Paper text:
Further local refinement on the four protomers using C34 symmetry-expanded particles improved the density map to a resolution of 4.0 Å. Each protomer is assembled by FliG, FliM and FliN with a stoichiometry of 1:1:3. FliG in the CCW-C ring consists of the domains FliGN, FliGM, FliGCN and FliGCC and adopts a twisted “V”-shaped architecture, which is distinct from the extended apo structure of FliG from A. aeolicus. FliM consists of three domains, FliMN, FliMM and FliMC, and adopts a lifting tong-like structure with FliMN and FliMC as arms. The protomer of the C ring has a “Y”-shaped architecture, and obliquely binds to the neighboring two protomers in a “S”-like manner, which generates extensive inter-protomer interactions within the C ring. The long linking loop LMC, which connects FliGM and FliGCN, binds into a cleft between α9 and loopα11–α12 of the FliGM–1 domain, close to the residues P169-A170-A171 (169PAA171), the deletion of which caused the CW-biased rotation of the motor, suggesting that the interactions play a key role in the rotational switching. The α15 helix of FliGCN and the following hinge loop LCC, which is formed by the conserved M233FLF236 motif, brace the FliGCC domain via hydrophobic interactions and stabilize its orientation in the upper region of the protomer. The αtorque (α20) helix of FliGCC, which interacts with the MotA subunits of a stator unit in torque transmission, lies on the top of the C ring. The stator-interacting charged residues, R281 and D288/D289, are located at the N- and C-terminus of αtorque, respectively. In the bottom subring, FliMC forms a heterodimer with the FliN1 subunit in a head-to-tail manner, while the FliN2 and FliN3 subunits form a homodimer in the same fashion.
The bacterial flagellar motor is a huge bidirectional rotary nanomachine that drives rotation of the flagellum for bacterial motility. The cytoplasmic C ring of the flagellar motor functions as the switch complex for the rotational direction switching from counterclockwise to clockwise. The basal body is made up of the LP ring, MS ring, C ring, rod and export apparatus. Here, we present two high-resolution cryo-electron microscopy structures of the C ring-containing flagellar basal body–hook complex from Salmonella Typhimurium, which are in the default counterclockwise state and in a constitutively active CheY mutant-induced clockwise state, respectively.
Residue numbers in the entry:
A (entry chain O), E (entry chain U): 34 to 322
B (entry chain P), C (entry chain Q), D (entry chain R), F (entry chain V), G (entry chain c), H (entry chain d): 51 to 137
The structure:
């Protein structure tokens, strides 16, 4: 079990199934299929790839160079999302929009996209953004805002560290022999606050019923019990003195102006000691806030 | 021994506890400024002395010229410690 | 409210109880290693969920990849709570 | 003795606990219907058996024809009891 | 009798015969037969299948993929009902509405329903909803409101748990060689409050007579007898002390501000002790409410 | 024995009952605030002492400096217990 | 402000802690040369960053051309700080 | 001795420190997210082991199946301790 430590190594984090994310992906796939059929005048076939959890560098190394990378923001959540379009899909869209029948196989170029191809990518991106926004709306309100387009991981650093966990959902688009692919990548920290919503499958809306459920849960927990402990004061000493504790030994302590009340080590208020009803009393002054 | 001397150079923290009690969270919410809360311990009983949260001895409260002090009286020998922890 | 947020910082303890039963001390003395003891609850009934020994909800037993889990199903609303305490 | 027989006529209550865990109140508020909550205990570990809230033995879960049952396995002898309470 | 426990196992719950539900199903079958004859211009044959009680997952696994699932709400009862239309029935309806004679056997497709087929399903659904509402009205007022249509169990979770008990009543529709089938599924918790009404067979209305019966039952029960016990106080102690109870032993107790009156362990009021007519008396202060 | 010591660590609950009476529900409904209800027991009779609802001894009411107390007088030996339960 | 600039001229000391653990003195005496001691923290968790013994942020270990470095990742905002101190 | 056994029951806290460095507050303010900070210690040097903030030994970092560990190598005998404190 004992292994030597390497600072350049990292581990994985079990499994983080997001059924709600998959449902959103399927809804977005339906909307994007409709949009692509409307745009290209031909029926596409969109297949939702398996959701992938991997470090950011692992996702980056698999991206062909050059590739179209678009920065988006999922308001009100903080972060920057990425929409990845493969060059093959862009070439297919350009060929279809300019009357190409697709007979000629695509040639590897490795060149920057032209401004016309940039406009084609923007035309795809707007529809994709609308579709994804509509898909997300079914479970939680979100707004997607495109930021800028880049053609290299050089222009990235959406993430603080290359080893940060990100969520990538591939999609495969087929309009014939074409098997183009586009991907959506989101950092895990962006969707971390909504982890509970995304993990368990969604239920019926019943917002008033859910609020009543929360209110009842609050009311029932209010009758729970705990232990209240008040620390009079603290003393710095040494172990040798402790070995010599004897009857009559006097240890000086600092006089506490206020008595702090702690619950399992959690301060809750500051008070002053008193003698009421023949027992020690604490006059509450201020709550810890 | 020599390791006792080594750990002697290591400072430790001592804690004196006036008393303890149990109540519900609802009762705590009912409490306001100036509220009175009772304790299990009685008047004149020796107070618990804790080292890093572990009770090791008991003492009596005294004042030294302007500062509170604890006059150690008894120990928490295992029989008494087990008896009071069983409570 | 703000005091709800204040008590939110205070951790609490949750207890899940499989079941309960009553028997004499003589029967307990008769029990040995490997003995079988029955419970009042039946198979498939939701288990009690207790916060500091107070029942607040019920759930169903599930296993999470290697760890047991409770899938909350119903609450202990005052009518049902009074009915089950009357028993 | 005769007083053991006298207290034998007095019924007592037995409690079986599946497991225990600790969490904040905010996490509990975050929990909704169908939420999953983990427990400290692992799979296959003997469950605690409590008499009036006091742990006295451990057992294993069995089903009797339609009813859950506990098959007693071990005891809570003072060394183990002190070790588990120290946790 | 002794068996080992498995958390992934569950049992059944005897029998829950609902004669009123069967009568409602028959009335709905009559109304739907009339509606289908009116719509398709041909006489259908509707057979009410045996009412089924099974866990939700068992019902889900038997549904062909894809299938038309419609979400309905039975107000004022809380929950979401489902109306299941088999693809064969939808195909038969589409064929009949567009002049098809039904000679050609249907081909397995496994494809999403078209918007025209969606409108056909909606046309069937409205009549089915009217019929079922009218059938339910005969025994208890209810309103059925369609929510949304889905084509997979992915879009379900009408139930909190897959093992929840649901009630499914199959129906078989025949307009020739066609033997199409549609099902109605309702969670047991939705109809749980009305269990008494649905179990025993309905009688004549006699609402005034029933109210008089209830009033007489209330009046007769008012003369019943019970035992009132007031607990003075409680003490926490240990068994060793109990073994040493002797004459003259004094046990301190907390002074009760109020005396709580319990009936078979059920508190009913809080009072204070008194001495009236040479016997102990309790001055009632507040009732437990 | 050793098991007596083991159950000694288990706390129990004691109940003191002033008296008992029987009446109809209609009479209870007739009762209002300030109503007077009689009890079967007379003045000066020892009060019942119950452990978890089981009568084990009898005592007399005393006051300790501000707190009520019970001065144990007699026991509920099986002959007397059977005689009073037969009532 | 200007006093922030004044204290800027005052250097401070930063401390990075790999992890923490608890054990008895007897176990420490049992330890010899080459002994293996475990830590509470797991592999890959951010390490604590302390200023004069006070935790203010967390980071990840990196190596700079021959020298270890800490890549700051998160902060110790009061909710998380209270949660980790409660442990 | 017997008091060594008594203090053995008292748990203590162990602290492992990766390294230390000194810098101005202005430099700390200049630091942002992802900034790189160097340490005085070199690569491969044994890390300091502290008990309640007091250095008592040194060790080497190892990983145990998923958890970091410290492999104790040397001690902080008074000559070396004085030499390193003089720095």
């Amino acid at each position: 079990d004992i292994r030597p430590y390497d600072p350049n190594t990292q581990r994985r984090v079990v499994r983080e199934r997001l059924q709600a994310l998959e449902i959103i992906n399927e809804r977005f796939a339906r909307q994007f299929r409709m949009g692509l059929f409307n745009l290209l005048r031909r029926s596409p076939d969109i297949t939702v790839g398996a959701i992938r959890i991997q470090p950011y560098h692992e996702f980056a190394r698999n991206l062909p160079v050059p590739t179209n990378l678009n920065l988006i923001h999922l308001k009100p959540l903080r972060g920057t999302g990425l929409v990845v379009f493969s060059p093959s899909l862009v070439f297919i869209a350009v060929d279809n929009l300019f009357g190409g029948d697709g007979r000629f196989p695509t040639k590897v170029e490795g060149r920057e996209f032209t401004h016309t191809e940039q406009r084609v990518i923007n035309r795809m991106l707007k529809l994709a953004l609308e579709g994804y926004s509509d898909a997300w709306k079914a479970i939680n309100p979100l707004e997607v805002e495109y930021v800028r387009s880049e053609m290299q991981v050089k222009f990235t650093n959406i993430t603080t560290s290359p080893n940060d966990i990100v969520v990538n959902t591939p999609f495969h688009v087929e309009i014939g022999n074409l098997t183009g692919e586009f991907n959506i990548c989101l950092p895990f920290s962006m969707i971390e606050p909504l982890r509970e919503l995304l993990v368990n499958p969604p239920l019926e809306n019943s917002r008033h019923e859910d609020q009543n459920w929360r209110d009842n849960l609050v009311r029932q927990v209010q009758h729970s019990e705990l232990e209240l402990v008040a620390n009079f004061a603290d003393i710095p000493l040494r172990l040798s003195q402790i070995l010599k504790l004897k009857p009559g030994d006097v240890l000086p302590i600092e006089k506490p102006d206020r008595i702090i009340a702690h619950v399992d080590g959690v301060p809750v208020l500051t008070s002053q000691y008193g003698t009421v009803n023949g027992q020690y009393a604490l006059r509450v002054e201020h709550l810890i806030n | 021994m020599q390791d006792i001397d080594l750990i002697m150079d290591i400072p430790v923290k001592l804690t004196v506890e006036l008393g303890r009690t149990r109540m519900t969270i609802k009762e705590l919410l009912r409490l306001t400024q100036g509220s009175v809360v009772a304790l299990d311990g009685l008047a004149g009983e020796p107070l618990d002395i804790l080292i890093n949260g572990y009770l090791i001895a008991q003492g009596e409260v005294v004042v030294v010229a302007d500062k509170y002090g604890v006059r150690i009286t008894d120990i928490i020998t295992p029989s008494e410690r087990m008896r009071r922890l069983s409570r």
